[PDB]
Amino acid sequence: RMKQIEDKLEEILXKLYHIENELARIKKLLXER
Amino acid sequence: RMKQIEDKLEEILXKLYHIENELARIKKLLXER
Amino acid sequence: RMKQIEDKLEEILXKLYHIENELARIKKLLXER
Amino acid sequence: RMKQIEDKLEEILXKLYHIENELARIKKLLXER
């Protein structure tokens, strides 16, 4: 269960690192001159 | 507790997959031609 | 440890539900007519 | 494993607190008068 939980957390972290790679689309829609 | 924790993680993942489905509203407010 | 972990997850969920209440500021900056 | 899991959660929380410090860039791109 423990090393299942840990390898859900390393799914959550690799979602967050998708969400950051959306936020850095959004910041670059909102742009360089 | 373990398979409670795991089924909080599968609540966290199904929040993140709401947050992604806000980010993909925001990116499509910021739009197609 | 288990019911510590679970009550970090219920900290993570109550962050996500701050992050959603930023996203629903951002969507309402981006607005009603 | 438990106090490994807990110290992934305190990695997740310190990601979320990066994501909040992007959202508060985005809200301040979208600005003060």
Side-chain angles (χ1 to χ4, degrees), chain A residues 1-2 4-6 9 11-16 18-20 22-32, chain B residues 1-2 4-6 9 11-16 18-20 22-32, chain C residues 1-2 4-6 9 11-16 18-20 22-32, chain D residues 1-2 4-6 9 11-16 18-20 22-32:
Chain A
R1 289 319 174 193
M2 298 265 246
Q4 291 159 222
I5 288 159
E6 216 177 302
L9 299 182
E11 199 174 327
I12 293 167
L13 281 149
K15 234 81 194 80
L16 291 171
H18 189 245
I19 291 166
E20 287 174 61
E22 304 286 69
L23 294 168
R25 289 187 207 278
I26 287 160
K27 283 197 308 193
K28 242 348 154 138
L29 290 163
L30 283 175
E32 66 169 17
Chain B
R1 289 319 174 193
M2 298 265 246
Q4 291 159 222
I5 288 159
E6 216 177 302
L9 299 182
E11 199 174 327
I12 293 167
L13 281 149
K15 234 81 194 80
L16 291 171
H18 189 245
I19 291 166
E20 287 174 61
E22 304 286 69
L23 294 168
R25 289 187 207 278
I26 287 160
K27 283 197 308 193
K28 242 348 154 138
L29 290 163
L30 283 175
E32 66 169 17
Chain C
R1 289 319 174 193
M2 298 265 246
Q4 291 159 222
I5 288 159
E6 216 177 302
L9 299 182
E11 199 174 327
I12 293 167
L13 281 149
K15 234 81 194 80
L16 291 171
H18 189 245
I19 291 166
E20 287 174 61
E22 304 286 69
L23 294 168
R25 289 187 207 278
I26 287 160
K27 283 197 308 193
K28 242 348 154 138
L29 290 163
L30 283 175
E32 66 169 17
Chain D
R1 289 319 174 193
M2 298 265 246
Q4 291 159 222
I5 288 159
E6 216 177 302
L9 299 182
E11 199 174 327
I12 293 167
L13 281 149
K15 234 81 194 80
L16 291 171
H18 189 245
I19 291 166
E20 287 174 61
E22 304 286 69
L23 294 168
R25 289 187 207 278
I26 287 160
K27 283 197 308 193
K28 242 348 154 138
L29 290 163
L30 283 175
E32 66 169 17

